[PDB]
Amino acid sequence: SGEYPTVNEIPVGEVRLYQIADGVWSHIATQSFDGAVYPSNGLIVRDGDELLLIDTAWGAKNTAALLAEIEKQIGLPVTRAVSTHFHDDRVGGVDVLRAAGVATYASPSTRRLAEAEGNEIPTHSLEGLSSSGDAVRFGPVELFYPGAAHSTDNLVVYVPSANVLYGGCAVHELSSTSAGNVADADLAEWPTSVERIQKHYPEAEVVIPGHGLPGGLDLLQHTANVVKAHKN
Numbered sequence: 409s410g411e412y413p414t415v416n417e418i419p420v421g422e423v424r425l426y427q428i429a430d431g432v433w434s435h436i437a438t439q440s441f442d443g444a445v446y447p448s449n450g451l452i453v454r455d456g457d458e459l460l461l462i463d464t465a466w467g468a469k470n471t472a473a474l475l476a477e478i479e480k481q482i483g484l485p486v487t488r489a490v491s492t493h494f495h496d497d498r499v500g501g502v503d504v505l506r507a508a509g510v511a512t513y514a515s516p517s518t519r520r521l522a523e524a525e526g527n528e529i530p531t532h533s534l535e536g537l538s539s540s541g542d543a544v545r546f547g548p549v550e551l552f553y554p555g556a557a558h559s560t561d562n563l564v565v566y567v568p569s570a571n572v573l574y575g576g577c578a579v580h581e582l583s584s585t586s587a588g589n590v591a592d593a594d595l596a597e598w599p600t601s602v603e604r605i606q607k608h609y610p611e612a613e614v615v616i617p618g619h620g621l622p623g624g625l626d627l628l629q630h631t632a633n634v635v636k637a638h639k640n
């Protein structure tokens with residue numbers, strides 16, 4: 409009923425949307441992984457009379473439920489999707505999207521890592537993002553490659569009309585006590601990558617992590633802090 413929906417509040421298989429700003433929503437779903445349940449976020453950005461999707465809802469059935477929830481709550485077609493790194497919480501559901509008419513995109517680095525890992529593979533490659541600090545426009549957002557952090561391929565997304573910074577899994581929520589799933593992370597480079605984000609998007613008003621609650625710019629410094637302590 410209005411607060412940001414939380415892990416214990418969403419059954420696995422249901423999706424909820426949360427209005428972030430005019431024409432910007434997050435999507436929230438839950439999934440089981442190695443015997444524990446986790447929430448995860450994505451983004452929806454209005455693109456005239458179409459929608460741009462950032463990240464799947466972590467699985468095929470969750471992503472089908474996402475499309476149904478978008479049609480119920482918004483009623484505009486999802487035409488393009490971008491996955492911000494290669495893990496299942498970002499690409500799991502790409503096959504569902506591709507069968508629902510959605511053109512799926514990711515960097516070549518993400519596509520290679522997804523293919524090598526056995527994860528679902530976005531169709532189209534996003535060039536122009538291979539060097540840290542690179543930025544490209546994609547509909548109503550800017551895509552930014554900050555450098556290696558949670559993964560070597562992680563992208564962040566900025567919505568300039570609303571000053572919304574979607575950090576994806578390179579950014580953690582304020583309540584976090586460690587750096588999440590660090591399997592593919594570069595803990596040494598992560599603070600430098602976060603510093604690049606801070607320098608590039610100083611006017612961000614909302615910061616959305618890959619998992620958990622949105623907040624303000626403090627999420628970036630908090631992320632650096634929990635990562636530095638995890639490495640140590």
Ligand SMILES: C[C@@H](c1cccc2c(-c3ccc(CS(C)(=O)=O)c(F)c3)c(C(=O)O)[nH]c12)N1C[C@H](CCCN)OC1=O
Pocket residue numbers: 441446495496497558577580581583584585586587588589590591592618619620
């Ligand atoms: C699918 C993904 C994956 C699965 C399960 C959990 C997560 C978490 C995660 C964990 C804890 C917290 C709370 S907290 C900040 O307080 O610790 C959190 F917010 C997020 C993340 C993430 O941190 O983004 N991602 C996960 N996977 C799988 C892949 C490894 C595959 C190797 N066989 O790597 C990866 O990330």
Ligand SMILES: [Zn+2]
Pocket residue numbers: 493495497558559577589
């Ligand atoms: Zn990940």
Ligand SMILES: [Zn+2]
Pocket residue numbers: 495497577618619
């Ligand atoms: Zn993640």
